[PDB]
């Protein structure tokens, strides 16, 4: 264990010597270390890592945590749970995000519009309705034998 | 089908709406019209356990086909004649439905001619 | 067992060739036999009527 | 053990690789790896395969069996 | 149900068109056939849907076993860009693969004839919808097209696998189940459809272009895909199109949804529920 | 995978990596072998005609626009080898790569099932235990006073000892421990 | 810029150690030191069929609605073997063209 | 021949 | 067959006689005959031996009918003895009514499975009995809470009787 | 069953086979200890193409940094041996 | 014909402009990061294949990450109007929304039952 | 209504048998994939029997086999609706699974 408060995370660094001590604690460089902007919730002196998922790490390089794609002693991202390879990916795609979203939305909207068009202009066959005997199967579909239904008549043609 | 193009492109007033068929009295163009016969009765359709979709006017051919299948359960390739009889009855029923469709369409044409004359 | 080959065609055994040829032949024989017997792959067997040739008298319309 | 064929057997004449070499020499270019790719078009794999040759596999014997079955059916009835 | 099934069969056929992994091609084919069954359920024909369930079970089991034999013989090589001359080097597996592909496309008097063609007749003769009908027929043509893609890029052209041949055959545990499922995929649809009691009665009075439409569009898809594959044989680089990128990236649905829904959900869950 | 990356990639390295990636994506586009050879010769000709520039800024701009063209018309689903990242069967046998220290936790019955192997294993453990101190001494004696230290490691300098930190890569599990 | 002699010599020595370790991974010849047609169908079908049939006949038919079947699809023109209730056939069948 | 020792955890317990 | 047709009705089966118009043998009949001779006969012998042993060591058990204690309506409030006895007999009747409802549901399911395609027509009396018993159950036990009691059931019945009496005024 | 194991002699023979089919070099001059630039007269593009051919021959990918470290057929053979765990 | 990145699907190292306009300051920074990585790797490797090691490796980076995620948030939380508004809306808005949803639904159901327009068809056990 | 019921329940029992053999500590002495493949094919035959029976008479059984709980006029009980769909899909799935099991015995070798 032997984990003491001078190497545990602390409060926000407000002086250059505090920032140097925080960078030395987190095994970073002084200019690379950059804490959160004191935007409310309790980020202390914890660094702002560049917000890229573990899929974008070099996969041929052998890591100390090979599943995490991260070496021993490297600063962990705050959202490592989000950014593990079991979860959210941020790797670059061959197609840009905005045009991917526009293509997907346009495809879905086009299909919905064409389904509405085909609903308002249905396709059928030049036939009349199907004819069923015995008052359109009144007793077989369920009716009171005491009550006499209105007789529907299927005339021959 | 060309009926769909004629309904959606030429006009929909003279081409029939398939929900409201017939929209004319059945005893209009016929001085006398025969009742459609139904060979199979309710009791034997119930005993033959036909589904309510297939209790139409070819139920007797369906009953004969099912009886053939039950009798010759082995060698299932033996009720081809009963199958063809049932299918031909269904084809005739579909032809009757097409006749009803065309009758309603020409009745709408006659109504259009009458409204033009008046 | 089959010996590996470096860059030539592998030594085919007779059994796999015979089995594949038999399966393909059986498939085509079944296709030809069923098409010969029941030709409902084309047109059905009911000769779809044309409503335009149905007469006004058999459809029951009144004239003017 | 595994025995390697003579690499000198891998020539490129009479090949799509030969057509590629001609089209590259039209613009003053040379393909070095052609003999490395040459084995894929040699005697084991030289025959072109067509879609009818794939689909109509076994069609001759299937048709022969169909003819024999028709003859047997006619002989029976 | 009809609209959902038509949409998924068209979309998954589109995704299956420009795919390279054999398992991915047959997975999207499976999704397309499930969409076709959903279309059949959109009509009032559940029994035809169940018939296609049994028929498709035979088909895809046999196709996946053929693909697994191809993969095992090519040493876990799963994409079609590294295989060829399968009709010459693995004649049994290629023959069963062609049987399964033809049966899936709906070559007549196979197991696919007795379900898929009745489905096509029902969807042509039903009073349901127009756009669903149109994209169902288009999806059937695309089914023929990706089956042709499999057949061409696997069983045809020239060898592209690594040189060291290690294709082992004549294993009974490999040949016998593929033989049994080939027998199923040839005869079982006929046997089942002639033993099934008549329910959900069909209509058989239809014009010739509503009866043979499925066969026509399957042949058309085969011819179109063969022509496109010969165009790939032609020695020229084409310009990449957004339709092809859309198809090969699965409509961008996995990328977009699987990156925006987990990110928003997990980030909201942490940054509100826990730490706020 | 066996050499650790340096601090930065040189211009020659970046050009070679782009060349290899462009050839792979070109193959993925033109699947067929003759077509691939034709277009690979064309790509090699382009690299040869931009090869000799004698202007670092012009060369870097050429590399930048070449990477732009590659990202513009790369294959969306390129060919990936099996047992390579992103491909099938990449981390397939990691569930079978047992890390070899569980043999210490093996029961005496199980150790008795393989006596000669465990005798050889005991010999290996004795060799590691005897070599560790000289490994540490060599690593401390390696001239890295301050500043530039790379991830490389030295060999066995004197006669009779072992390269430092050898155990974790000599006794690694086999790539197919099946 | 290939291999500097530093990492070249390291790779050579590590390679020799790896070859020795992999050679030592081999098994000795004595290692590991260990300490009819239808009988399966009789054992694994007939006995479970006996148990299942006992449970079906004497613990389901003894209960009211555990096994319920539908009607056996009586057709016009057969004999019911329960009370002697042969049912009459259909009518004259006016259409006999096909 | 060429049988190799596969490394397995202690399954005895 | 401990069950009786008075409480579990079942119409008599009407199976048709076979008419084997084909010349092929029936594998179903052959397999049923072999199945009888191989499986049914030893199982019958084992059950007959077991029943003989039971008839040797025959014993009896009874029903334990309870008699009607005075109900919640006819004794004073705050008397925990009468309230306890009325609550226990009401819980007893509640459990009995639960199983009456279960009997009617089993009867309805049996009707539907027996009739199959004709369930919409000839299950009229089973569905009618199910609807009437459902209406009575909803009138007596529906809106009572998870702490349902004789007092709560009485309060619900009195409210319903008041509403019916008020409606009967006009 | 499938996948016969590969030995050092087979790896050396296949590497020498591909390099003899390069057709750019080796008019019966190639050895196993011949450097690609020192005594074979190649450049970096040629070495990259050689690595690509070795990858396509053996069915697996050599990563870029190790690949650019490789400069001789002997160390190509050693790399294949180290990756595939040869001489068990 | 240009790739537009985002927080998801970010920009490649082959497309960012900083890779091509390099400076000696950035080269020195990269060398220093390599030195830090190499020192940590050497320490880990010594601790990893030390034969006298009988336990695991403690990973103070992971310990710091866990402590910062768990026991540091309230010591380093400062109330601001922004997080006060965020906490109020996130803790009350869903509650009030589902309150009005369930209240309106149950009031409608109770009114329908009392006026008799809602019938329980076969709902015996609720 | 005896042979049909015992065939359905025998399908289930023959499927459950290799599970018990797996948790019965004799796997190391038998050929488990071959034994399971034989179990699946015998299940397929026993499932072919009610397929023929349903093709004959179409009886549509409603077996119960067990009663689990009775909770305030809700009888949660085991029940099998042996239907057209159930019978045909059982036969097809058993045939397919027999083929897949033998293919897996070939395919997952050295696993
Ligand atoms: C009179 C007319 C003018 C009124 C007016 O202008 O009001 C402005 C005033 C906001 O002032 P501001 O400009 O945000 O103040 C910023 C400071 O000047 C500068 O900010 P600062 O950083 O210097 O101050 C530090 C911090 C000082 O520290 C704090 O304020 C500590 C936090 C105080 C409570 C915060 C409640 C919201 C968070 C709830 C979280 C979830 C709870 C569980 C669910 O200040 C703040 O957080 C600012 C917001 C203070 C809100 C005070 C609310 C008092 C009434 C609370 C009633 C009960 C609420 C629910 C309680 C439930 C208990 C179970 O109020 C409003 O706009 C709405 C509220 C109106 C009254 C109700
Ligand atoms: C209606 C249907 C209702 C049920 C529906 C269930 C649906 C959901 C299924 C989820 C399946 C999850 C799963 O895959 O679990 C894998 C899990 C083990 O699979 P595995 O990954 O190979 O694990 C093996 C180990 O990794 C490595 O161990 P190994 O390879 O040496 O394996 C040796 C084997 C050796 O097995 C044993 O030693 C068996 C231990 C219990 C023996 C009991 C003897 C009683 C004698 C009385 C006289 O041990 C095991 O496989 C696991 C041992 C623990 C199993 C505990 C099962 C419950 C026992 C309850 C006893 C109650 C006694 C009351 C008195 O399997 C189970 O938990 C049992 C099988 C699934 C449930 C039973 C079968 C279905 C229901 C039949 C009725
Ligand atoms: C030629 C050869 C032919 C042979 C034919 C058969 C002859 C024969 O042996 O007849 C049986 C013969 C005489 O038959 P019987 O006298 O007519 O039968 C009257 C009953 O035994 C009267 O019942 P009992 O209470 O006296 O004895 C049976 C009792 C025995 O029970 C016990 O003894 C208690 C347990 C002790 C454990 C000790 C360890 O079993 C039960 O009460 C039920 C056991 C259920 C086990 C399976 C549970 C599955 C749970 C599924 C969970 C998921 C549900 C999903 C639902 C989904 C839908 C909602 O012997 C027995 O009955 C004894 C069987 C003992 C079986 C023990 C193992 C199972 C428990
Ligand atoms: C898993 C779910 C299994 C469900 C079936 C359990 C069968 C065993 C059973 O029900 O045993 C209890 C039964 C007596 O039941 P009961 O009549 O209620 O007893 C009152 C008498 N004092 O006792 C008996 O019947 C005793 C005789 C048992 C003989 C062997 C029974 C074998 C049953 C095989 C089929 C079980 C279900 C198969 C399908 C499972 C699907 C997962
Ligand atoms: C009962 C609890 C009541 C709590 C009341 C808290 C009121 C806070 C009002 C306020 O000042 O809100 C500020 C907030 C964000 O503004 P700011 O803090 O400047 O942050 C810039 C980045 N959004 O402003 C907003 O979020 C704007 C909201 C507009 C609606
Ligand atoms: C998918 C298709 C992808 C298409 C990508 C097309 C990119 C091709 C465009 C080019 O070739 S522009 C190449 C620009 N590179 C240079 O100018 C590098 C020149 N600088 C040098 O130092 C060169 O001499 C070398 C080649 C890097 C030195 O290497 P030597 O062989 O050791």
Cross-chain residue pair A9–K59, CB shorter than 8 Å: no
Which residues neighbour L10 within 8 Å (Cβ) at sequence distance 6 or greater? G45, G48, G49, G52, L43, L46
Instruction: Map F13-46 to HEC letters.
Output: HHHHHHHHHHHHHHHHHCCCHHHHHHHHHHHHHH
Residue E170 CA: distances (Å) to CA of K61, L101, L111? 56, 18, 21
Nearest CA among D64, B72, B105 for reference residue C21: D64
The beta strand positions in L1-111, using DSSP E, are 61-70, 75-82
The CA-atom distances, in angstroms, between F100 and each of D8, F107, F174 are 47, 14, 11
State which residue of chain D sits closest to C26, comparing Cα positions: D62
Contacts of G87 (CB under 8 A, 6+ apart): B44, B47, G74, G76, G77, G78, G80
SS3 E21: strand
Q: Which residue's CA lies nearest to atom 27 of ligand 2?
A: H11
Q: How far does CA E45 lie from the centroid of its chain? A: 22
Q: CB atoms < 10 A from the CB of I76, how many?
A: 7
- Residue L76, beta-bridge partner list: L69
With contact defined as beta carbons under 8 Å apart, do B15 and B108 qualify? yes
- Interface membership of E187 toward L (CB under 8 Å): no
Residues of K with CB under 8 A from a CB of L: 124-125
CB contact under 8 Å between L52 and I105, yes or no, is: no
- Whether G76 and B88 lie within 8 Å, measured CB to CB: no
Between CA A90 and CA F64 the distance in angstroms is 23
Q: What is the spatial distance between Cα I85 and Cα I93, in angstroms, rounded to a whole number? A: 12
Q: Nearest-CA neighbor of F130 among F101, F99, F169, F162?
A: F162
For the record, the structure tokens of F172 come out as 């690694």
The minimal CB distance from E92 to the residues C4, C16, C35 is found for C16
The beta-carbon neighbor of B63 closest among G75, G91, G94 is G75
Listing DSSP states for chain F in one string gives --S---SS--HHHHHHHHHHHHHHHHHHHS-SHHHHHHHHHHHHHHHHHTT----HHHHHHHHHHHHHHHHHS--SS----TTSTTSTTSSGGGGT---SGGGSSS-HHHHHHSHHHHHHHHHHHHHHHHHHHHHHHHHHHSS--SS---S------STT---TT-HHHHSPPPS---
Asked whether the bond before G20 is cis by omega within 30 degrees of 0, the reply is: no
Instruction: Give, using CA atoms, the residue closest to atom 27 of ligand 4.
Output: G55
Those residues with Cβ within 8 angstroms of residue C45's Cβ, 6 or more apart along the chain or in another chain: C39
CA G29 – CA C23 distance, rounded (Å): 46
- Residue B113 in tokens: 């001619």
In Å, what resolution does this model reach?
Answer: 3.0
CA–CA separation, I91 and F35 (whole Å)? 87
Three-state DSSP state, G80: strand
Q: Which of F1, F81, F174 sits opposite J66 (nearest CB)?
A: F1
Is L78 near chain G, with CB under 8 Å? no
Mutate which of K80, K84, K85 for ligand 5? The one with the most ligand atoms within 8 Å of its CB, which is K85
- G28 to chain H: nearest residue by CA? H3
Contact state of K9 with A64 under an 8 Å Cβ cutoff: no
**DSSP letter string over E54-79?**
HHHHHHHHHHHHHHHHHHHHTTS--B
Domain boundaries in chain J? 3-88
Q: Quick check: B96 and B1 in contact, CB under 8 A?
A: no
Paired with L67 in beta bridges are: L77
Touching pair K, G by Cβ (3+ pairs < 8 Å): no
Nearest CB partner across the interface for E166, out of J3, J56, J58? J3
Mutate to test the interface with B, among I113, I117, I123 (most CBs of B within 10 A): I117
Cis amide bond preceding F30, omega within 30: no
CB pairs under 8 A between C and D: 60
Distance from Cα K90 to the centre of ligand 1, integer Å: 15
Is K95 touching ligand 1 by the criterion CB < 6 Å?
A: no
Three state DSSP letters for K55-93: CCCCCHHHHHHHHHHHCCCCCCCCCCHHHHHHHHHHHHH
Q: Which residues of D touch J53 (CB under 8 A)?
A: 33, 36
- F141, F138, F126: which is closest to F162 by C-alpha? F138
Q: Which two tokens stand for residue D11?
A: 């020539």
Q: Is the CB of G18 under 6 A from ligand 4?
A: no
- As a whole number of angstroms, the distance between CA E209 and CA E211 comes to 6
Enumerate chain A positions whose Cβ falls within 8 A of a Cβ in I: 139-142
CA B76-B79-B82 angle, 5° bins: 155
Chains J and B touch (3+ CB pairs under 8 A): no
d(CA D25, CA D34): 13
Name residue H7's beta-bridge partners: none
| Contact criterion met (CB below 8 Å) for C34 and E190 | yes
Query: Residues 6 or more apart from I132 whose CB is under 8 A from it?
Result: none
Which letter, b or e, does each residue of F102-115 get, where b requires 16 or more Cβ atoms within 10 Å of its Cβ?
ebeebeeebbebbe
Beta partners for residue L70, in sequence order: L75
Which residue has a Cα nearest atom 19 of ligand 6? F51
| Chain F: touching chains (3 or more CB pairs < 8 Å) | A, D, E, G, H, J, K
State the Cα–Cα distance between residues E48 and E55, nearest whole angstrom. 10
3-state SS of C1-61 is CCCCECCCCCCCCHHHHHHHHHHHHHHHHHHHHHHHHCCCCCCCCCCCCCHHHCCHHHHCC
- Give the residue from chain A lying closest to F76, CA to CA: A94
**Distance, CA of E126 to CA of E200 (rounded, Å):** 13
């Amino acid at each position: 264990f032997h984990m003491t408060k001078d190497m545990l995370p602390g409060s926000y660094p407000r002086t250059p010597e505090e920032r140097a001590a925080a960078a030395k604690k987190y095994n970073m460089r002084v200019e690379d270390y950059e804490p959160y902007p004191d935007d409310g919730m309790g980020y202390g002196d914890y660094p702002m890592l560049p917000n890229r998922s573990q899929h974008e790490r070099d996969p041929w390089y052998q890591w100390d945590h090979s599943e995490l794609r991260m070496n021993w002693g490297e600063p962990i991202h705050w959202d490592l749970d989000m950014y593990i390879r079991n979860r959210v990916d941020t790797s670059p795609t061959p197609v840009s995000w905005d045009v991917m979203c526009k293509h997907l939305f346009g495809f879905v909207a086009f299909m919905v519009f064409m389904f509405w068009v085909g609903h308002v202009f249905p396709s059928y066959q030049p036939v009349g309705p199907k004819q069923y005997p015995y008052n359109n199967l009144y007793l077989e579909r369920g009716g009171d034998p005491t009550k006499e239904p209105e007789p529907v008549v299927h005339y021959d043609i | 089908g060309a009926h769909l193009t004629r309904r959606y492109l030429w006009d929909a007033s003279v081409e029939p709406d398939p929900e409201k068929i017939p929209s004319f009295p059945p005893d209009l163009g016929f001085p006398e019209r025969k009742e459609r016969v139904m060979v199979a009765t309710q009791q034997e359709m119930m005993d033959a356990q036909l589904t309510l979709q297939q209790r139409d006017y070819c139920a007797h051919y369906l009953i004969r086909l099912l009886k053939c299948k039950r009798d010759s359960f082995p060698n299932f390739l033996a009720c081809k004649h009963e199958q063809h009889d049932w299918d031909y009855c269904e084809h005739l029923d579909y032809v009757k439905r097409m006749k009803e469709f065309e009758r309603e369409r020409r009745l709408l044409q006659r109504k259009k001619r009458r409204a033009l004359k008046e | 067992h089959i010996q590996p080959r470096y860059r030539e065609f592998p030594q085919l055994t007779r059994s796999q060739v015979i089995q594949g040829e038999f399966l393909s032949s059986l498939m085509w024989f079944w296709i030809l036999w069923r098409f010969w017997h029941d030709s409902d792959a084309v047109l059905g067997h009911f000769s779809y009527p044309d409503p335009s040739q149905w007469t006004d008298e058999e459809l029951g319309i009144p004239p003017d | 053990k595994m025995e390697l064929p003579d690499y000198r057997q891998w020539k490129i004449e009479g090949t799509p690789l030969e057509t590629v070499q001609k089209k590259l020499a039209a613009r003053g270019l040379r393909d070095p790896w052609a003999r490395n790719e040459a084995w894929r078009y040699m005697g084991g794999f030289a025959g072109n395969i067509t879609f009818p040759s794939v689909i109509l596999k076994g069609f001759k014997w299937g048709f022969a069996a169909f003819v024999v079955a028709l003859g047997a059916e006619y002989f029976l009835d | 149900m009809l609209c959902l099934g038509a949409l998924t069969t068209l979309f998954t056929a589109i995704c299956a068109l420009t795919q390279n992994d054999i398992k991915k091609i047959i997975a999207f084919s499976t999704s397309s056939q499930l969409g076709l069954m959903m279309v059949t359920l959109g009509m009032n024909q559940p029994h035809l849907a169940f018939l296609h369930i049994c028929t498709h079970a035979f088909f895809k089991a046999m196709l996946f076993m053929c693909s697994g034999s191809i993969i095992h013989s090519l040493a876990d090589e799963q994409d079609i860009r590294k295989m060829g001359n399968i009709t010459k080097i693995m004649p049994f597996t290629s023959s069963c693969l062609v049987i399964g592909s033809l049966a899936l496309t709906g070559m007549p008097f196979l197991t696919g004839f007795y379900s898929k063609d009745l489905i096509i007749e029902a969807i042509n003769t039903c009073n349901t919808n127009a756009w669903a009908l149109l994209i169902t027929l288009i999806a059937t043509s695309m089914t023929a097209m990706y089956s042709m893609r499999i057949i061409y890029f696997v069983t045809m052209t020239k060898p592209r696998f690594p040189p060291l041949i290690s294709i082992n055959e004549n294993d009974p545990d490999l040949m016998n189940p593929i033989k049994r499922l080939a027998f199923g995929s040839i005869f079982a649809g006929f046997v089942i459809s002639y033993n099934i009691p008549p329910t959900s009665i069909p209509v058989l009075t239809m014009p010739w272009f509503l009866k043979t439409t499925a066969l026509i569009i399957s042949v058309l898809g085969f011819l179109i895909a063969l022509e496109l594959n010969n165009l790939t044989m032609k020695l020229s680089m084409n310009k990449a199109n957004p339709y092809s990128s859309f198809s090969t990236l699965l409509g961008f649905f996995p990328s977009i949804i699987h990156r925006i829904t987990p990110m928003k959900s997990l980030n909201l869950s942490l940054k509100t529920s826990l730490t706020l | 995978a066996f050499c650790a990356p340096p601090a930065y990639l040189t211009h020659q390295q970046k050009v070679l990596r782009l060349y290899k990636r462009a050839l792979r994506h070109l193959e993925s586009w033109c699947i067929h072998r003759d077509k691939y050879r034709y277009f690979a010769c064309l790509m090699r000709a382009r690299f040869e005609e931009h090869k000799n520039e004698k202007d670092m800024m012009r060369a870097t701009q050429l590399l930048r626009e070449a990477e732009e063209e590659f990202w513009q018309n790369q294959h969306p689903q390129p060919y990936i080898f099996p047992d390579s990242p992103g491909g099938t069967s990449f981390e397939r046998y990691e569930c079978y790569k047992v890390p070899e220290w569980c043999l210490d936790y093996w029961h005496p019955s199980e150790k008795a099932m393989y006596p000669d192997y465990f005798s050889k294993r005991e010999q290996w453990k004795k060799l590691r235990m005897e070599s560790w101190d000289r490994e540490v001494k060599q690593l401390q004696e390696e001239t890295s006073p301050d500043g530039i230290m790379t991830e490389a490691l030295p060999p066995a300098r004197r006669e009779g000892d072992l390269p430092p930190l050898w155990w974790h890569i000599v006794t690694r599990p086999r790539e197919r421990p099946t | 810029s290939g291999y500097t002699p530093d990492e070249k010599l390291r790779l050579q020595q590590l390679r020799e150690l790896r070859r020795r370790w992999l050679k030592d991974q081999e098994l000795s010849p004595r290692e590991p030191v260990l300490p009819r047609s239808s009988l399966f169908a009789v054992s694994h079908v007939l006995i479970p069929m006996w148990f299942v049939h006992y449970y079906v006949k004497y613990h389901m038919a003894t209960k009211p609605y555990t096994i319920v079947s539908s009607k056996p699809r009586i057709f016009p023109g057969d004999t019911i073997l329960e009370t002697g209730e042969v049912i009459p056939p259909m009518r004259d069948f006016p259409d006999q063209h096909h | 021949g060429k049988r190799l020792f596969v490394v397995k955890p202690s399954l005895y317990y | 067959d401990s069950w009786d047709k008075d409480v579990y009705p079942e119409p008599p089966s009407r199976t048709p006689a076979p008419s084997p118009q084909t010349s092929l043998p029936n594998p179903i009949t052959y397999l049923t005959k072999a199945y009888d001779l191989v499986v049914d006969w030893p199982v019958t012998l084992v059950r007959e031996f077991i029943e003989r042993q039971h008839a040797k060591n025959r014993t009896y058990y009874y029903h334990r009918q309870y008699r009607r204690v005075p109900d919640i309506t006819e004794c004073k409030e705050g008397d925990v003895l009468c309230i306890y006895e009325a609550e226990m007999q009401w819980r007893r009747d509640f459990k009995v009514d639960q199983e009456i409802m279960n009997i009617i549901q089993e009867r309805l399911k049996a009707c539907q499975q027996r009739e199959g395609e004709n369930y919409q027509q000839n299950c009229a009396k089973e569905l009618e009995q199910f609807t009437k018993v459902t209406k009575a159950y909803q009138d007596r036990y529906l809106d009572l809470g998870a702490y349902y009691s004789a007092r709560k059931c009485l309060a619900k019945q009195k409210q319903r009787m008041l509403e019916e009496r008020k409606a009967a005024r006009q | 069953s499938d996948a016969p194991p590969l030995t050092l002699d087979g790896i050396k023979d296949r590497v020498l086979y591909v390099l003899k089919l390069y057709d750019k070099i080796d008019p019966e001059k190639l050895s196993v200890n011949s450097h690609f630039m020192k005594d074979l007269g190649l450049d970096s593009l040629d070495q990259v193409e050689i690595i690509m051919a070795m990858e396509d021959e053996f069915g697996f990918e050599i990563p870029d940094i190790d690949a650019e470290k490789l400069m001789c057929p002997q160390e190509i053979v050693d790399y294949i041996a180290d990756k595939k765990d040869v001489y068990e | 014909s240009k790739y537009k990145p985002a927080p998801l699907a970010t920009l490649p190292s082959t497309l960012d402009p900083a890779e091509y306009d390099v400076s000696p300051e950035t080269r020195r920074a990269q060398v220093e990061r390599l030195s830090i990585r190499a020192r940590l790797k050497r320490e880990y490797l010594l601790q990893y294949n030390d034969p006298k090691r009988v336990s695991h490796i403690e990973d103070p980076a992971l310990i710091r990450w866990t402590y910062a995620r768990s026991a540091n948030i309230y010591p380093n939380f400062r109330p601001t109007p922004k997080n006060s508004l965020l906490g109020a809306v996130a803790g009350f808005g869903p509650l009030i929304f589902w309150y009005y949803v369930f209240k309106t639904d149950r009031d409608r159901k109770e009114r329908l039952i009392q006026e008799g327009k809602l019938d329980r068809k076969f709902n015996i056990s609720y | 209504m005896n042979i049909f019921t015992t065939s359905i329940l025998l399908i289930f029992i023959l499927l459950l048998s290799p599970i018990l053999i797996s948790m019965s500590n004799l796997i190391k002495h038998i050929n488990f994939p071959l034994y399971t493949t034989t179990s699946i094919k015998f299940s397929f035959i026993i499932s072919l029997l009610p397929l023929l029976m349903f093709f004959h008479n179409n009886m549509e059984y409603m077996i119960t086999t067990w009663h689990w709980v009775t909770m305030n006029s809700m009888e949660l009980k085991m029940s099998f609706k042996t239907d057209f769909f159930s019978i045909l899909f059982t036969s097809v799935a058993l045939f397919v699974t027999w083929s897949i099991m033998q293919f897996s015995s070939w395919y997952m070798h050295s696993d």
